[PDB]
Amino acid sequence: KPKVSLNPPWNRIFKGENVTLTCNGNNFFEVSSTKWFHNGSLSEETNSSLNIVNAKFEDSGEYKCQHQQVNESEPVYLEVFSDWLLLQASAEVVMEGQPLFLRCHGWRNWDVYKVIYYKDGEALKYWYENHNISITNATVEDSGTYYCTGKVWQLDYESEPLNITVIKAPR
Amino acid sequence: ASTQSPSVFPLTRCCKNIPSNATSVTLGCLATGYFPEPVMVTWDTGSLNGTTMTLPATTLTLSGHYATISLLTVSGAWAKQMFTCRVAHTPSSTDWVDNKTFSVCSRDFTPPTVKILQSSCDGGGHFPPTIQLLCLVSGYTPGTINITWLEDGQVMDVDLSTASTTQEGELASTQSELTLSQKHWLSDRTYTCQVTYQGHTFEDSTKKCADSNPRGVSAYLSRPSPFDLFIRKSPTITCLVVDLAPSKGTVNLTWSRASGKPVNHSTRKEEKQRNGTLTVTSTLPVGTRDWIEGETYQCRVTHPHLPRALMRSTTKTSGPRAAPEVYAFATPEWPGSRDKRTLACLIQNFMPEDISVQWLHNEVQLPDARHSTTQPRKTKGSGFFVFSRLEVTRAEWEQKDEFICRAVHEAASPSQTVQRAVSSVA
Amino acid sequence: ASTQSPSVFPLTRCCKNIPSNATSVTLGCLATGYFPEPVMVTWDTGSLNGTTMTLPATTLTLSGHYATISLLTVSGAWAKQMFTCRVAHTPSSTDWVDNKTFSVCSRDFTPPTVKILQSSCDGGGHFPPTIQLLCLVSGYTPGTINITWLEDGQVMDVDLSTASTTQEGELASTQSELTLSQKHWLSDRTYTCQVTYQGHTFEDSTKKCADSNPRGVSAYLSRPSPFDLFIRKSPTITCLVVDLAPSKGTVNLTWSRASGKPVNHSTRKEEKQRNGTLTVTSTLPVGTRDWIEGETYQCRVTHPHLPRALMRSTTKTSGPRAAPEVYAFATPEWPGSRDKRTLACLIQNFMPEDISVQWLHNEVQLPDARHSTTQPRKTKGSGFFVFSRLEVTRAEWEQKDEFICRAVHEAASPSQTVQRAVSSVA
Amino acid sequence: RTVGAPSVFIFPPSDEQLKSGTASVVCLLNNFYPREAKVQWKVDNALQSGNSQESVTEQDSKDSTYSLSSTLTLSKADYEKHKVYACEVTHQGLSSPVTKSFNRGEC
Amino acid sequence: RTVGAPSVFIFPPSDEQLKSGTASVVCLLNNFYPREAKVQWKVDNALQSGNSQESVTEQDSKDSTYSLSSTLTLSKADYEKHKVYACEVTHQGLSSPVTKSFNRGEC
Numbered sequence A: 001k002p003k004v005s006l007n008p009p010w011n012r013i014f015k016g017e018n019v020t021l022t023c024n025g026n027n028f029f030e031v032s033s034t035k036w037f038h039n040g041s042l043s044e045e046t047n048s049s050l051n052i053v054n055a056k057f058e059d060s061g062e063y064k065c066q067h068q069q070v071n072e073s074e075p076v077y078l079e080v081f082s083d084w085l086l087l088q089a090s091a092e093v094v095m096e097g098q099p100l101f102l103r104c105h106g107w108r109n110w111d112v113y114k115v116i117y118y119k120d121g122e123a124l125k126y127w128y129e130n131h132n133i134s135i136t137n138a139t140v141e142d143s144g145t146y147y148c149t150g151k152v153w154q155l156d157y158e159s160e161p162l163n164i165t166v167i168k169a170p171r
Numbered sequence B, C: 001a002s003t004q005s006p007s008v009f010p011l012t013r014c015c016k017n018i019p020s021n022a023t024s025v026t027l028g029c030l031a032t033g034y035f036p037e038p039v040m041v042t043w044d045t046g047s048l049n050g051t052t053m054t055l056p057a058t059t060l061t062l063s064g065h066y067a068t069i070s071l072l073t074v075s076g077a078w079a080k081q082m083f084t085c086r087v088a089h090t091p092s093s094t095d096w097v098d099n100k101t102f103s104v105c106s107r108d109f110t111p112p113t114v115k116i117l118q119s120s121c122d123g124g125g126h127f128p129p130t131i132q133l134l135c136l137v138s139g140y141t142p143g144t145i146n147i148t149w150l151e152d153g154q155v156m157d158v159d160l161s162t163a164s165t166t167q168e169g170e171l172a173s174t175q176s177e178l179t180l181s182q183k184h185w186l187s188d189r190t191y192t193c194q195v196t197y198q199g200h201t202f203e204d205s206t207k208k209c210a211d212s213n214p215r216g217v218s219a220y221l222s223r224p225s226p227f228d229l230f231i232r233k234s235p236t237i238t239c240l241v242v243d244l245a246p247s248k249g250t251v252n253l254t255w256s257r258a259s260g261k262p263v264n265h266s267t268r269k270e271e272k273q274r275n276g277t278l279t280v281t282s283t284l285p286v287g288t289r290d291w292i293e294g295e296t297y298q299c300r301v302t303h304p305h306l307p308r309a310l311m312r313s314t315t316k317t318s319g320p321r322a323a324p325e326v327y328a329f330a331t332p333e334w335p336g337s338r339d340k341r342t343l344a345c346l347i348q349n350f351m352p353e354d355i356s357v358q359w360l361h362n363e364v365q366l367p368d369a370r371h372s373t374t375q376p377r378k379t380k381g382s383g384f385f386v387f388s389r390l391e392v393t394r395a396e397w398e399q400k401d402e403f404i405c406r407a408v409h410e411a412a413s414p415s416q417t418v419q420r421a422v423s424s425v426a
Numbered sequence D, E: 001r002t003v004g005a006p007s008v009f010i011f012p013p014s015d016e017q018l019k020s021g022t023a024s025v026v027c028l029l030n031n032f033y034p035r036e037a038k039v040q041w042k043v044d045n046a047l048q049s050g051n052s053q054e055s056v057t058e059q060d061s062k063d064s065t066y067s068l069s070s071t072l073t074l075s076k077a078d079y080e081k082h083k084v085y086a087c088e089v090t091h092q093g094l095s096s097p098v099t100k101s102f103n104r105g106e107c
């Protein structure tokens, strides 16, 4: 089947930010045209990559793609927020040992200082500036509801929490 | 629209443009910012003759206010004669009189200028243990001059600074030196050099320097004061938004009630500060019964450069109630304090925390600035307390030695006020 | 070794060391740093008759060259007489003659002082388009003076700065103003003011400052509490550094005095906080007298990830002194509260702001948790005030009904302590 | 009556009005006939519109003339953003439009 | 001959030697007999050793006394950091060791 790829990979963006959904599978059938499915409705884009420009609140929701095959792609979900700090994350469900990058991101390239990540309530790591937590070998205990506290323009802001859960790759 | 009192300002032609041989001159007064019509203007010319003529008013488009100009034309010894304009607005009050007294010419002098220099930190980037601020008032026409230093706007004692004036030729030069600890300088406080010269004010500002100064908008929302709620009976709430970056455009500021019932019209002031920000204040009148019965009011702040809307809300405290205890005291007489005394008041065991404290003397409630009042703090048991301190002078207690400390508080009975008198001599 | 010419220098006593009534004086010339032997020294004494004397040379240990002193003792009008010493070194050359001409009281060294002042940045901390540096040479005996500016040790063009000189009484003052671009100031180059007075060089330097928070870390440094200082006679100061990273590599914490005298060991302590940050706290005991006489204490922190060392400094106040007034009151009985009272203490008009407040009952100091004291705030005139509040029980005043409010403050005499007792029944 | 020229005057805002946070630069046209008088405000030689309010008086009972005052209303900050302030008076009694000007710092 | 006391003098370094970067503090002991004279260097009331060179002449042919010059050699920074410089002369002709001193502030 054609799986759906995200550039940048992050399914949680800010209002107004861009993202481009690309969708590809094994080339058993030659690539001619693609179908897009915002919420269930067919989008007016044929191209294999759809560029979601300037996010609005209505740009939220279930996304899906399709080719001339007999069967469809998975229901990737894209929530869109306007707020001060969004604790972005690579994937919402991962299997151990895949790369996981986390990023406590601030509105319009703004720089968040005194950044602290929380995993399930406890302080996982703190750094002076914003950082890219990166765990390449996710453990099954890594599953938690995460959130990050930061300081943007001298004021304190907590991101909305986001739960992530790992699974065992055998079975 | 509410009744508004006019602001009266002079209007004289500028004397470099006035010919010296002109035997006659026209001056005037602008009365602007009042509701409703009319005002009456009279002119006292001293001893000269004069012709008074008042124009029809102009309705200001932006605010709907009225602006009228009343002119006087005089002849004779015009340049040396005092001139007074007296404006009465009987809608404001029957005895409302604005008296503005001035001359045709306030004369021409060279502008003084002000600049502030500072100690340099050393070759390693470290501050010295004390910081010198040197306020320099460059060449001005010799005259009486005063320099005041302010720390975040509050006057410091003159003992902590020096001042020096020299004269070279026909021009004076003034310098003032202020000494500060390194600790105060590193705390990012802002210091103002205030120059008073011939009844005109100049100023300059400084704070600890910086390679960069990020700042963001913050917002605060007050409750009505008990004094305004129960004595004045005209409660208001204020949404104050500070430290916004003066970008392009006006900041969107909206009042709403959780019930969906209508809000009154609010007033809005925007003011640039010494420290580089723009502070916006919005004041909303609230209903007295509305507030007392538990309504919740919301201030919503939006701006295109903001990430999200900023929201603040305010409502009557849901805690229990308890009446204030009041105690007033005078300090004893001792050496060095013969003609100035200090009075004190303790207000305690009240609940909830919002309270207004004033001092009354001889059938006038003295201005709030005369005294100081601490912030409410928790008692060990149940309720809050505050202290108030009032320095008084000999003429006041010789006028009347009874000084009343009064607290206004929602739980006080029977009329939401409690007061106690003290006499210093007994 | 190699052949080296002697360096010839005069040798005369200080003008305050030579007695005015001396009938004879001994002067000399030191010829140092020559190799091999010998040198030949002669003296031109003008019209006076004197006795010359040549000593054997002493070999310099560091280079192996020779150093000799040639003295001359004269009598008569030796103060006004001009003396020449003529040294030749025949290994160097047959006609190398060093003629050093000087009087017995030619001059004493006179150190002009150097200080660098600088432009302001404004009230938002932003830099102006240019930076002024003002080098001041204040209060020196008049004479020839030159001022040169260096940028990273190279002489800048003469037209880029302007110097001026004034005189007041005996003492002279000189100033020089340099204009820099904002970019140059912000590049962190070092600027040196080089003052050459009577042929000798005096220097001061500056570079872009360092604003106390390089990587978002904060550091705070307290003063001793007056209670610790004057009652326990064990004053301590505390340096606390917050928001460091929990990485490896221990932080380097060092204490020092500006005078270089030794400091004791401190209580170095680290602990990770619940929010994932790391705080380091150290408490240093300091000498009581050392503090009272105005020593400056410095806390210096270095972490491997920080780009430069971070320093904080603390010292005693530089303002005037005023002892506190202490007033103590007992509340009268309030209906329904038979078994409790509140004691209020007003402490006022003291300078500087540092103060400790204690309460005592039955000659023993009560726990701090029993009473609440406000933070120092300014009075209307000179000095600061605080209020203290203590709730007491019937069992306590029936045990002993006298309670003492005691203030410890640096300006109080004779032992930095003033107290006032109060009774609830009277 | 005959055609009377306007006596053209200009008045700055007072320092107390600058303390109040507003500014009203006045151009007075005293004792003109006929009533058709045009006042054009310029600030640093840039024409202004939407902030000029012209109070026009009645016909005087003695000389049968009229009076006018054009009030240019600005903010305090907008007042000190500029230096030159002038008003141009076009009228039948003036052969050319008379421009009366002043500056802030000379006063 | 008879026991002669040293006339003890102290000479500061010249400012030209400070321009050269060295400093030679001289203590002159004039006209003393016998030759056994001890010179000690007290810099800010701290005894110095290993940086002093004593030059002694032969017996004079007129008074049969001796002349000594003790030279304390230091750097310019080492000279400028210290304030009071003194030489203490112990000799048979002196009942107490005579200390002759000067101060950098007044020299």
Ligand SMILES: *[C@@H]1O[C@H](CO)[C@@H](O[C@@H]2O[C@H](CO)[C@@H](O[C@@H]3O[C@H](CO[C@H]4O[C@H](CO)[C@@H](O)[C@H](O)[C@@H]4O)[C@@H](O)[C@H](O[C@H]4O[C@H](CO)[C@@H](O)[C@H](O)[C@@H]4O)[C@@H]3O)[C@H](O)[C@H]2NC(C)=O)[C@H](O)[C@H]1NC(C)=O
Pocket: B190, B215, B218, B220, B221, B222, B223, B225, B240, B242, B243, B273, B274, B275, B276, B277, B279
């Ligand atoms: C640049 O310059 C501007 C102007 O000087 C500074 O603006 C100040 O900002 C501070 C905070 O950012 C303001 O302080 C706030 O004032 C509010 C107004 O309350 C006043 O009015 C009530 C009457 O109802 C009085 O009782 C009260 O005492 C005040 O006089 C307060 O309500 C705020 O309190 C809030 O914060 C405290 C914590 O500090 C909480 O405990 C409270 O519960 C409440 O939430 C607050 O104190 C200050 O008023 C502003 N100045 C002016 C003139 O308005 C900028 O801060 C400055 N920026 C920099 C970087 O220097």
Ligand SMILES: *[C@@H]1O[C@H](CO)[C@@H](O[C@@H]2O[C@H](CO)[C@@H](O[C@@H]3O[C@H](CO[C@H]4O[C@H](CO)[C@@H](O)[C@H](O)[C@@H]4O)[C@@H](O)[C@H](O[C@H]4O[C@H](CO)[C@@H](O)[C@H](O)[C@@H]4O)[C@@H]3O)[C@H](O)[C@H]2NC(C)=O)[C@H](O)[C@H]1NC(C)=O
Pocket: A114, B187, C218, C220, C222, C242, C243, C273, C274, C275, C277, C279
């Ligand atoms: C993670 O959690 C830690 C705590 O575990 C937080 O660390 C706190 O950081 C704050 C911010 O600096 C600290 O607050 C500071 O406390 C100092 C302690 O002073 C003591 O002594 C004085 C005088 O006797 C007392 O009055 C005071 O109450 C204390 O007992 C204060 O001196 C500091 O004052 C500073 O701010 C004021 C304005 O409020 C200025 O006027 C001052 O000049 C000065 O600049 C300050 O209040 C706090 O103490 C720290 N906690 C602990 C336990 O020490 C971290 O901040 C937190 N991480 C993040 C990212 O927030």
Ligand SMILES: *[C@@H]1O[C@H](CO)[C@@H](O[C@@H]2O[C@H](CO)[C@@H](O[C@H]3O[C@H](CO[C@H]4O[C@H](CO)[C@@H](O)[C@H](O)[C@@H]4O)[C@@H](O)[C@H](O[C@H]4O[C@H](CO)[C@@H](O)[C@H](O)[C@@H]4O)[C@@H]3O)[C@H](O)[C@H]2NC(C)=O)[C@H](O)[C@H]1NC(C)=O
Pocket: A038, A039, A056, A057, A058, A059, A060, A061, A062, A079, A080, A082, B308, B309
């Ligand atoms: C495809 O299906 C999707 C879901 O099936 C649809 O997504 C939904 O769209 C609506 C409207 O576009 C979203 O509602 C959002 O907008 C209103 C109005 O915005 C105001 O409130 C915001 C509060 O966050 C402010 O930030 C704004 O500035 C503005 O003042 C909000 O009231 C909503 O907020 C609520 O929901 C969000 C989470 O979405 C919470 O964070 C808030 O606290 C509050 O509870 C929304 O912001 C709706 O959120 C969205 N659904 C999701 C899951 O995001 C989509 O419209 C549809 N598309 C098409 C083409 O059919």
Ligand SMILES: *[C@@H]1O[C@H](CO)[C@@H](O[C@@H]2O[C@H](CO)[C@@H](O[C@H]3O[C@H](CO[C@H]4O[C@H](CO)[C@@H](O)[C@H](O)[C@@H]4O)[C@@H](O)[C@H](O[C@H]4O[C@H](CO)[C@@H](O)[C@H](O)[C@@H]4O)[C@@H]3O)[C@H](O)[C@H]2NC(C)=O)[C@H](O)[C@H]1NC(C)=O
Pocket: A145, A163, A164, A165
């Ligand atoms: C990411 O992490 C989040 C944080 O843990 C997860 O949210 C959690 O969801 C669970 C639901 O599975 C919540 O658990 C219960 O929440 C409320 C609170 O229960 C209270 O009342 C009960 C009596 O009714 C008591 O017995 C409880 O002890 C408690 O006091 C319940 O109402 C829920 O009931 C729901 O689920 C049951 C099935 O279990 C249904 O039968 C019910 O009809 C109802 O629909 C839950 O029992 C938990 O509180 C919540 N955590 C937080 C912090 O909010 C989130 O699910 C997770 N997501 C992923 C993808 O991993």
Ligand SMILES: *[C@@H]1O[C@H](CO)[C@@H](O[C@@H]2O[C@H](CO)[C@@H](O)[C@H](O)[C@H]2NC(C)=O)[C@H](O)[C@H]1NC(C)=O
Pocket: A016, A017, A018, A053, A054
């Ligand atoms: C989101 O993507 C669009 C598409 O490229 C960007 O649009 C460009 O905008 C810049 C200036 O804003 C123009 O110079 C380009 O021509 C635009 N590109 C196209 C293809 O038209 C847009 O800028 C992006 N948004 C953000 C916030 O980066």
Ligand SMILES: *[C@@H]1O[C@H](CO)[C@@H](O[C@@H]2O[C@H](CO)[C@@H](O)[C@H](O)[C@H]2NC(C)=O)[C@H](O)[C@H]1NC(C)=O
Pocket: A070, A071, A072
């Ligand atoms: C997803 O793709 C697979 C690929 O064939 C589909 O599998 C067949 O689906 C039909 C559905 O009508 C069944 O009748 C067949 O028996 C399935 N083939 C098998 C099981 O070998 C599958 O149906 C597709 N799913 C959807 C929803 O289209």
Ligand SMILES: *[C@@H]1O[C@H](CO)[C@@H](O[C@@H]2O[C@H](CO)[C@@H](O)[C@H](O)[C@H]2NC(C)=O)[C@H](O)[C@H]1NC(C)=O
Pocket: A008, A101, A102, A103, A130, A131, A132
């Ligand atoms: C977190 O990781 C992402 C991707 O791994 C980083 O995004 C890159 O940032 C650099 C520098 O800002 C850019 O040049 C790249 O183009 C970005 N790549 C992508 C895919 O976005 C992000 O910067 C990292 N965050 C931190 C704090 O290092």
Ligand SMILES: *[C@@H]1O[C@H](CO)[C@@H](O)[C@H](O)[C@H]1NC(C)=O
Pocket: A047, A051
């Ligand atoms: C789709 O791809 C084609 C191929 O280059 C391109 O010309 C076209 O612009 C694309 N459409 C969009 C919407 O990007």
Ligand SMILES: *[C@@H]1O[C@H](CO)[C@@H](O)[C@H](O)[C@H]1NC(C)=O
Pocket: A097, A098, A136, A137
């Ligand atoms: C994760 O750790 C295990 C340790 O047993 C190792 O075998 C595996 O290769 C690691 N995977 C990655 C992606 O580092």
